[PDB]
Short mmCIF file of C-alpha atoms in Angstrom, two decimals:
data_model
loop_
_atom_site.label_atom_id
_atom_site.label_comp_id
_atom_site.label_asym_id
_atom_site.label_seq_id
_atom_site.Cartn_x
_atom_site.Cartn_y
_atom_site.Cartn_z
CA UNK A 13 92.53 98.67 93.58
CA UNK A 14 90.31 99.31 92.36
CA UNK A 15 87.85 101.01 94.99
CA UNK A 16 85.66 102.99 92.94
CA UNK A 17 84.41 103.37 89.32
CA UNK A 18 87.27 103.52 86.64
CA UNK A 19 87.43 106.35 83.88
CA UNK A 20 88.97 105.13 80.61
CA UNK A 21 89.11 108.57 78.69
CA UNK A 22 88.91 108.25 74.74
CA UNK A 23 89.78 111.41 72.92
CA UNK A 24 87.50 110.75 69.99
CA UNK A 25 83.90 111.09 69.73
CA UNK A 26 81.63 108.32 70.51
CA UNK A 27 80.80 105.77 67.71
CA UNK A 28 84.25 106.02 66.06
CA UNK A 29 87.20 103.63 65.89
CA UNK A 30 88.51 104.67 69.08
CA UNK A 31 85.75 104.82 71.49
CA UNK A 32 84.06 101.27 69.73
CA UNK A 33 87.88 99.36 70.68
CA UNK A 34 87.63 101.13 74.45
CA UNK A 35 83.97 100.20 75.21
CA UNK A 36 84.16 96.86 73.73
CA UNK A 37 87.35 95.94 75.98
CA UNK A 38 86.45 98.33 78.88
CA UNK A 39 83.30 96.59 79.52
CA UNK A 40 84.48 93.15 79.73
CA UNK A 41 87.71 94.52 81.94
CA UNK A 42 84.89 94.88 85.02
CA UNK A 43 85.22 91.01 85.40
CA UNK A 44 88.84 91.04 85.84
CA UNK A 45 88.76 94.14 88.25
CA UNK A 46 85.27 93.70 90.19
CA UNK A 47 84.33 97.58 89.56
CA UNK A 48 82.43 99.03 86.66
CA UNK A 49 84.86 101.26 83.57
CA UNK A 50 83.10 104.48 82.95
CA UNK A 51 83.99 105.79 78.92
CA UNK A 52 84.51 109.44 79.12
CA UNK A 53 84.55 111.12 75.43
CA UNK A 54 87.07 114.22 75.96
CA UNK A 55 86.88 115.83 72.59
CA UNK A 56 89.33 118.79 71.98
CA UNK A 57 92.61 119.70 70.73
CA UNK A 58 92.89 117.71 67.68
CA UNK A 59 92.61 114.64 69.93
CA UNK A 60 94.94 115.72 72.33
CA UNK A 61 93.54 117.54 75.18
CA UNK A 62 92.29 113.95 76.83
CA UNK A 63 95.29 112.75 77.18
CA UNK A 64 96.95 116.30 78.20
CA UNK A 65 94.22 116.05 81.31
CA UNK A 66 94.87 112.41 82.08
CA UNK A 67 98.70 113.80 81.94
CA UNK A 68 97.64 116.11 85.49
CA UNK A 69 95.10 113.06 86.34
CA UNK A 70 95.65 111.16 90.01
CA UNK A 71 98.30 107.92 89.08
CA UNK A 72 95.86 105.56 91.39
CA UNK A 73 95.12 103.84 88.43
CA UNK A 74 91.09 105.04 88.62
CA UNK A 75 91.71 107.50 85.49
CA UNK A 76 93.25 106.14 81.90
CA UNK A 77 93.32 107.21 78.99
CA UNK A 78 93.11 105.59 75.22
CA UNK A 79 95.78 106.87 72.97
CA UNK A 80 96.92 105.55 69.70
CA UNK A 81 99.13 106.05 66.75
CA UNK A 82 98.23 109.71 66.51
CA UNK A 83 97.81 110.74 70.24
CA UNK A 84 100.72 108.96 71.30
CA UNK A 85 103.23 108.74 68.60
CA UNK A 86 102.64 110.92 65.24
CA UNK A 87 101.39 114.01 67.20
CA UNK A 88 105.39 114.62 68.58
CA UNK A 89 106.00 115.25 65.28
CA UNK A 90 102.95 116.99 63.63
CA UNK A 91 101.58 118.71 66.59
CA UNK A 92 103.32 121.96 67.23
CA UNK A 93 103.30 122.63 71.37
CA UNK A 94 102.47 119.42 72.31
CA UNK A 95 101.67 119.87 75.78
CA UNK A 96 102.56 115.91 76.75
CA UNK A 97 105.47 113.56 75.67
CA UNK A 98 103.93 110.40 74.84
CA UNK A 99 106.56 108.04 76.23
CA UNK A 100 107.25 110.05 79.29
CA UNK A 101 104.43 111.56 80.70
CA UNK A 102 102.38 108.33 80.49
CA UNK A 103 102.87 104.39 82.47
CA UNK A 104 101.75 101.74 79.62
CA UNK A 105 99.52 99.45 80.40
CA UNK A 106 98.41 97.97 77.38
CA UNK A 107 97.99 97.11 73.63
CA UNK A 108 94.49 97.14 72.95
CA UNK A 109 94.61 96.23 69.12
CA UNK A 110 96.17 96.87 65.71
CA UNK A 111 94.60 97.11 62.67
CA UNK A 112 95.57 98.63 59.30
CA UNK A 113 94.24 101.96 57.74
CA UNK A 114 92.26 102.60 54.67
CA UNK A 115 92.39 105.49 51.78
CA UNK A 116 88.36 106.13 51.56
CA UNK A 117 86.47 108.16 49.40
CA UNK A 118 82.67 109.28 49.06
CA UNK A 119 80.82 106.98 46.65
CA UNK A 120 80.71 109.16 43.19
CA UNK A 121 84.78 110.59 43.49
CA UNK A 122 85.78 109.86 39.69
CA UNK A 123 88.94 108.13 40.27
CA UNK A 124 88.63 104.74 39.83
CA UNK A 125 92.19 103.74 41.15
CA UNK A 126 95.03 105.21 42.86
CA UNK A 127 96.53 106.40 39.33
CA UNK A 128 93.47 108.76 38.47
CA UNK A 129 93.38 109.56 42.08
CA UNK A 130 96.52 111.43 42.32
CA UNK A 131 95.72 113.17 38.98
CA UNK A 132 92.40 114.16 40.28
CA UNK A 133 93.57 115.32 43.92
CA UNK A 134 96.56 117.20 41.66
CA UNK A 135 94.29 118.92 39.58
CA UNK A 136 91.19 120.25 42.04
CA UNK A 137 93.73 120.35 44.60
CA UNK A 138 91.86 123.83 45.44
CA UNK A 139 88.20 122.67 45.62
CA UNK A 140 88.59 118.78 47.88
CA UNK A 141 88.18 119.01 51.50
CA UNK A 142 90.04 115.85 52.98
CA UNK A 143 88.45 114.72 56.42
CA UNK A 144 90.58 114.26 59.81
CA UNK A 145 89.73 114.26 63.56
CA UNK A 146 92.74 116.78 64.33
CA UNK A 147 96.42 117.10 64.20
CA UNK A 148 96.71 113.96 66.99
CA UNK A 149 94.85 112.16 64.87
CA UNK A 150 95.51 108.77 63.10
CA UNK A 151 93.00 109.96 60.02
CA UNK A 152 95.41 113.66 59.99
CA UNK A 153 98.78 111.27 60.37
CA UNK A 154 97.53 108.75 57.27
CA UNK A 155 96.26 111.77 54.99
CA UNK A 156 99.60 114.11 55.63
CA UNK A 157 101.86 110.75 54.57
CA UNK A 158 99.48 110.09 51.65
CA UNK A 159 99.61 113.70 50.23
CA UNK A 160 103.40 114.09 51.06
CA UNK A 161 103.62 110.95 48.97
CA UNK A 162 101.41 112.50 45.79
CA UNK A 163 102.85 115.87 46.14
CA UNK A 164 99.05 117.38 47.01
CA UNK A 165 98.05 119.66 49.65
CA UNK A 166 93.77 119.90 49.62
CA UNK A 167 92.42 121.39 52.04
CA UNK A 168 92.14 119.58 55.98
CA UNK A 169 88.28 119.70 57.25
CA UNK A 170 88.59 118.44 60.74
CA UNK A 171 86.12 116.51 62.61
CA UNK A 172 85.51 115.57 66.66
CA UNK A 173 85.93 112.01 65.29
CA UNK A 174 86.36 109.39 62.30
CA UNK A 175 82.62 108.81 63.33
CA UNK A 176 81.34 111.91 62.28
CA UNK A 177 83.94 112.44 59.73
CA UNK A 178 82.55 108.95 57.98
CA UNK A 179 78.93 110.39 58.01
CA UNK A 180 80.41 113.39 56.57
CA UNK A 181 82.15 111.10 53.49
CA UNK A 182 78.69 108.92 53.71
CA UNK A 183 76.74 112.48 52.66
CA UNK A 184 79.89 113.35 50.34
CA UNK A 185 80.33 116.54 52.64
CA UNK A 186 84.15 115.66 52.33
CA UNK A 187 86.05 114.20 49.12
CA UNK A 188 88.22 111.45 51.24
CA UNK A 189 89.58 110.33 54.64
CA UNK A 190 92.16 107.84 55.81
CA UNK A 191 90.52 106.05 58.12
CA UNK A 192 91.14 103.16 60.69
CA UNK A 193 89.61 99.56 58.99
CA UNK A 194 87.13 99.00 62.29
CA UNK A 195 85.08 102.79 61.59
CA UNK A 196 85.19 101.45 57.30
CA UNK A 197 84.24 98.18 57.47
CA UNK A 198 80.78 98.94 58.58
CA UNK A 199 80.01 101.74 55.64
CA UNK A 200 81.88 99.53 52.89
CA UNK A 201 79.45 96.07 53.41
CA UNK A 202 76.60 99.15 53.59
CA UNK A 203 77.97 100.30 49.93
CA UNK A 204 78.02 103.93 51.89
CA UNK A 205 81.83 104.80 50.62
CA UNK A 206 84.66 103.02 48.69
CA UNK A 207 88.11 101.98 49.64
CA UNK A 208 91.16 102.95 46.92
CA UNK A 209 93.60 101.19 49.23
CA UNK A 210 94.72 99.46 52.37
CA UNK A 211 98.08 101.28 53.97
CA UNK A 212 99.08 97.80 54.64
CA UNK A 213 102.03 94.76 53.06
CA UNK A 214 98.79 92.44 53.05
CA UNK A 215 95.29 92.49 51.79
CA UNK A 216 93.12 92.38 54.77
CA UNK A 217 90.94 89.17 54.68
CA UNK A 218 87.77 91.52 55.93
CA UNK A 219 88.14 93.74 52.70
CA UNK A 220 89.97 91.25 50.37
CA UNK A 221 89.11 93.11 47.22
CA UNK A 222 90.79 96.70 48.75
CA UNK A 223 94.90 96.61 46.85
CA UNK A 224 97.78 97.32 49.35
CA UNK A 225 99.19 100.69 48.44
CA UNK A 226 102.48 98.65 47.37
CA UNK A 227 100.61 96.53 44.32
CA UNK A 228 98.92 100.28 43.61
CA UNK A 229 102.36 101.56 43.29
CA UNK A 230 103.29 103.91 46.45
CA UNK A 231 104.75 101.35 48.86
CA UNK A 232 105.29 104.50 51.24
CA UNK A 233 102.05 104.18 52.07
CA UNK A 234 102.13 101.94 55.50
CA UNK A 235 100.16 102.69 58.59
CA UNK A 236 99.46 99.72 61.44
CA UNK A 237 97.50 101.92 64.05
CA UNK A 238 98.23 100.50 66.94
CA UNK A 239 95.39 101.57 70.26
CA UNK A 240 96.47 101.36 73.37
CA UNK A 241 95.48 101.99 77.56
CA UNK A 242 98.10 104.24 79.63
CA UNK A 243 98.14 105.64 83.03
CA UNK A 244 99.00 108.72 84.30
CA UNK A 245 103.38 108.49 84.81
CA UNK A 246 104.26 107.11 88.26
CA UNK A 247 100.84 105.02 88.64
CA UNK A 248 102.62 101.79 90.64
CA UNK A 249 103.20 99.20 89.04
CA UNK A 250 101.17 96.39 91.02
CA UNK A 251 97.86 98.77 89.34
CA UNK A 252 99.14 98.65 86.12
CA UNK A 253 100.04 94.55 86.60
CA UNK A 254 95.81 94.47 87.48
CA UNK A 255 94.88 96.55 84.88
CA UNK A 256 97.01 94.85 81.93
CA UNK A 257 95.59 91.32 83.01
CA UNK A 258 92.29 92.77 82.97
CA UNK A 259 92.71 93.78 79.23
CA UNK A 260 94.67 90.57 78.58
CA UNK A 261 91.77 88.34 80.31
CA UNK A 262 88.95 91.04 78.41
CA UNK A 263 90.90 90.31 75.04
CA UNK A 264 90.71 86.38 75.37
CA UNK A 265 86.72 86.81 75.87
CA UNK A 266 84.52 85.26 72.70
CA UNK A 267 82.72 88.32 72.22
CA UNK A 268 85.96 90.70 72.00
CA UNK A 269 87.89 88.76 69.33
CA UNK A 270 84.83 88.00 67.27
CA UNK A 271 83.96 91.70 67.26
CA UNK A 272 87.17 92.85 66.72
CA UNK A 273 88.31 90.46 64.17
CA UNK A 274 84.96 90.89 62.28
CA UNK A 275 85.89 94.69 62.09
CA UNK A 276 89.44 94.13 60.52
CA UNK A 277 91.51 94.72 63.97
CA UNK A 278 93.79 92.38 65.42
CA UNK A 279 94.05 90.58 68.70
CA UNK A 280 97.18 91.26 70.34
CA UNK A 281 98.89 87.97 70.77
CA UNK A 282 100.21 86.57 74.39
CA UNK A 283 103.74 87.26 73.94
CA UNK A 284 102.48 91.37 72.77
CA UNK A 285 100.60 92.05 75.93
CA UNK A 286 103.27 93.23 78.42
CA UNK A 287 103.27 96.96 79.47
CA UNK A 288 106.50 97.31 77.75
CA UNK A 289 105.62 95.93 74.11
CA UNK A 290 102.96 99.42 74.00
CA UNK A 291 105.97 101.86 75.13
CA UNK A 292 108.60 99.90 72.32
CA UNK A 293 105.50 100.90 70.08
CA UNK A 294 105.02 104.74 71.35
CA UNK A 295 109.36 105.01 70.87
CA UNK A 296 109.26 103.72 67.51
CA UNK A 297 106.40 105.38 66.34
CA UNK A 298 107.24 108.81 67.53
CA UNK A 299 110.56 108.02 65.65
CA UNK A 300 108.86 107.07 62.61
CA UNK A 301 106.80 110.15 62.02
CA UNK A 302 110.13 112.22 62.89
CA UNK A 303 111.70 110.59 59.86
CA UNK A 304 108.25 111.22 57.75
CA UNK A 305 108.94 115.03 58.71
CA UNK A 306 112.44 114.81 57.13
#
């Protein structure tokens, strides 16, 4: 293993958070492996009808899939019919990254902080159009938490992607997003859209001037989006060994942590990298967003 090209399947259009962690780490994961990782975008299902194929994929270990905090954790609990069960219907591999989420907004939305912000979402509740990429979505899971927490429903516009939802809050097509700190970074130093706060206990150093939700006064508001590579269930565990030192050799390249750290996302550290830390991660998410529920 492997014998042939490998498909790494990212839900998410191309150019957003998702697909830029995959391809960055895919590509270097050749080395490690001695075959080339094809990136297949599989857009559909709010996010969730990649990893429902990968699901009924072949476990040899040639066809993965990225899932993350929405896909593979909040989605249990927001997505009604779920056709997969994250923990169970999936083999681990790896942790790919973490990195903390960001309330956005186009450049001209009046509030200045998170104060006039709720007052402003609570009053035009009827005519703002929030951006997500779907119901398995990180950017749906952040917005439902922060408008649960302010007591607003606006109006959901989804997108294929945080890529083309960004463009969308770049144009001011949509009023805000909650979006994953690698896809922001990139339009903030451009001046394209403004941050109101980090879902985060720390400032991030990349965006040191962006207040934690806690020193903005709604402490609720906490999401680490974790990304990670899983297999299809029963894919043996000698592939998955391979394929988990491929990412862990891929993260410890130059050019990976550089670009990833420069974007806001973390490494994950030695002692994170086992198969195992990823499925403690899908349990206690999926747990989580049961709680947010009730």
């Amino acid at each position: 293993f492997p014998v042939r090209t490998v498909t790494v399947v990212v839900p998410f259009a191309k150019g957003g958070p998702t697909d830029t962690v995959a391809r960055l780490i895919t590509a270097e994961m050749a080395k490690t492996l001695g075959q080339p990782i094809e990136i297949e975008n599989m857009l559909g299902a709010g996010g969730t009808l990649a990893a429902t194929r990968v699901a009924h994929a072949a476990p040899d270990g040639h066809t993965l899939i990225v899932g993350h905090l929405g896909t593979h954790g909040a989605a249990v609990a927001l997505f009604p019919k779920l056709a997969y069960r994250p923990d169970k219907d999936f083999t681990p591999v790896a942790l790919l990254t973490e990195m903390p989420v960001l309330l956005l907004a186009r450049k001209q939305f009046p509030p200045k902080d998170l104060s006039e912000f709720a007052s402003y979402v609570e009053s035009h509740t009827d005519n703002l159009n929030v951006a997500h990429a779907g119901f398995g979505s990180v950017s749906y899971a952040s917005c439902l938490l922060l408008n649960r927490l302010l007591k607003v429903d606006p109006t959901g516009v989804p997108f294929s992607g945080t890529g083309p939802a960004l463009q969308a809050l770049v144009e001011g097509q949509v009023d805000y997003m909650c979006d994953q700190i690698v896809n922001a970074v990139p339009a903030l130093r451009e001046g394209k859209v403004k941050a109101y706060v980090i879902a985060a206990s720390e400032r991030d150093p990349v965006v040191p001037d962006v207040p934690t939700a806690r020193e903005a006064g709604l402490p609720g508001f906490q999401v680490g989006a974790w990304t990670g590579l899983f297999a299809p269930r029963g894919t043996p565990e000698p592939i998955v060994a391979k394929l988990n030192a491929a990412v862990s050799r891929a993260l410890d390249q130059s050019d990976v942590r550089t670009r990833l750290t420069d974007l806001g996302a973390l490494v994950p550290r030695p002692e994170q990298r086992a198969p195992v830390v990823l499925a403690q991660l899908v349990q206690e998410e999926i747990s989580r967003w049961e709680d947010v529920v009730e």
